[PDB]
Amino acid sequence: RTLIVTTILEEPYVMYRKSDKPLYGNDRFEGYCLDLLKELSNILGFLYDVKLVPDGKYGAQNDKGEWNGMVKELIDHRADLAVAPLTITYVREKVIDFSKPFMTLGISILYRKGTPIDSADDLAKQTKIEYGAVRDGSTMTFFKKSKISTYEKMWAFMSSRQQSALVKNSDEGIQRVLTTDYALLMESTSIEYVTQRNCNLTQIGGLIDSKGYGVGTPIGSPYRDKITIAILQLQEEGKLHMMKEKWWRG
Amino acid sequence: RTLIVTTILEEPYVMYRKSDKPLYGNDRFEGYCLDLLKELSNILGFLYDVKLVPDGKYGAQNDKGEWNGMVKELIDHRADLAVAPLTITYVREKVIDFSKPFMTLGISILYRKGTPIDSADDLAKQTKIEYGAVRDGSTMTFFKKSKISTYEKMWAFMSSRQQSALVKNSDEGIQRVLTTDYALLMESTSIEYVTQRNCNLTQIGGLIDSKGYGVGTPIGSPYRDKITIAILQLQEEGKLHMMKEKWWRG
Ligand SMILES: O=C(Nn1c(=O)c(=O)[nH]c2cc(C(F)(F)F)c(F)cc21)c1ccccc1O
Ligand SMILES: O=C(Nn1c(=O)c(=O)[nH]c2cc(C(F)(F)F)c(F)cc21)c1ccccc1O
Ligand SMILES: [Cl-]
Numbered sequence A, B: 001r002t003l004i005v006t007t008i009l010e011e012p013y014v015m016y017r018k019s020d021k022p023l024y025g026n027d028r029f030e031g032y033c034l035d036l037l038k039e040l041s042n043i044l045g046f047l048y049d050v051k052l053v054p055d056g057k058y059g060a061q062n063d064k065g066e067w068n069g070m071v072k073e074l075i076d077h078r079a080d081l082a083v084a085p086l087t088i089t090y091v092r093e094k095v096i097d098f099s100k101p102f103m104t105l106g107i108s109i110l111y112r113k114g115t116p117i118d119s120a121d122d123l124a125k126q127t128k129i130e131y132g133a134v135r136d137g138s139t140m141t142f143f144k145k146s147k148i149s150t151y152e153k154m155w156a157f158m159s160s161r162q163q164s165a166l167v168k169n170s171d172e173g174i175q176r177v178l179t180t181d182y183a184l185l186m187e188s189t190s191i192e193y194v195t196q197r198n199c200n201l202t203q204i205g206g207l208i209d210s211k212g213y214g215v216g217t218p219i220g221s222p223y224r225d226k227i228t229i230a231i232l233q234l235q236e237e238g239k240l241h242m243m244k245e246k247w248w249r250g
């Protein structure tokens, strides 16, 4: 009767709740995706048990085509839903079902206020102002694998000089923006999170690519269509926006 | 054997092709959605006949709950697909099936370069700089129906003084931006189209809300899942981006 929900630790979607006593159930966790799950459970009417994906991965294939991560938990029917910031992608959609996205995002520009810089093309066109992304992440990988001429050119500049314009992780990139003349190309959701906490920083321009986070279900799940309708209901009602404000607020 | 595809005239998605001789079939039409349809037909393997929605409407309900538009063509099985900039919405998803979105968009800010204005909250906070939207459109309707405090406040200012800050249509709003000190809140897709043709105009900040355009199918259609996978394939391949560049280029 109780649905098993696979998720992953990722701020502010899923986090351990602060407490002294050790905790044991769903009370261990908080965040946007926990609130989303609660709202879904009260629209569709279900009990759930949250279980962190044991390998801590979203889901990718190895050289043999074997899956890992939350995707593999779904494939193997060890979870009924994946409620997490799980990106809807071609290779994943072939092996699991996704709801329509509860959040849409893309790459944007994190910079400083008070500049004539107001576009990504306003960077590919010049060299005075430098730019990078987090090493080995989704954004860097976008630029590295791109065949769009303008982003290839931007990858060429980011990876030049021993890739010095890249950074180890998001926390490191934020500090490099805070302490140096540096712009972090990164997901709009993270930029929004950061600007809420740093008033001289802002997002520049719109989204460079587009993607969505959806709820994953095993193929054939009866919950996929139900959850899509529920997400759309929550969106129409403004509740997705309220939840995002609660967890991104600064 | 031939699929009937309902669509709607909407620049640059679906337009009549320039010619002197009268035309008669799919050759009558061009645009982003015609290119999308061609690509879909070559992935999934189908013949199609394009037919403009006779009432020229996307699809809404009247007081009795009766549908019109492309949505009604699908409900009544007078079309097999709707390939058009058809917004995925709660009320529509209950009566037709949608693919995952081939385009995601939202409301943003169309302004001028060279200002410290870099956010929507950078407007709700002040009064010197004014702002509006197209009368009776999706963007104005967002603000009018919103219960988000900041957008309610923004609706209060837009509709003040006999609603003078609103405009009749997008073409009129563009000219009012070109000839006056005026910012048009409008869909990011239209802003992108306009900025490609006006170099002193730019998008300010990111997206205020989020929505997607999807391919509509009658409920139960076998094509829904096929088309979602196909769109994701095209996106992964960069072809959706190439098509958007072709039709938005300036
Ligand atoms: O995309 C990549 N990782 N990744 C997913 O795969 C997913 O499903 N959700 C994700 C959510 C987040 C969040 F922003 F929420 F923190 C994130 F940072 C990464 C995610 C990825 C990673 C390495 C190289 C290429 C990639 O593309
Ligand atoms: O949303 C409204 N109209 N509308 C749809 O309903 C849809 O499905 N697609 C649409 C695509 C476009 C495009 F930008 F492509 F031109 C558009 F301008 C409008 C669209 C709408 C209209 C009046 C009042 C409230 C509304 O919400
Ligand atoms: Cl769906």
Ligand SMILES: [Cl-]
Pocket (backbone or CB within 6 Å): A098, B098, B099, B100, B224, B225, B228
């Ligand atoms: Cl789908």
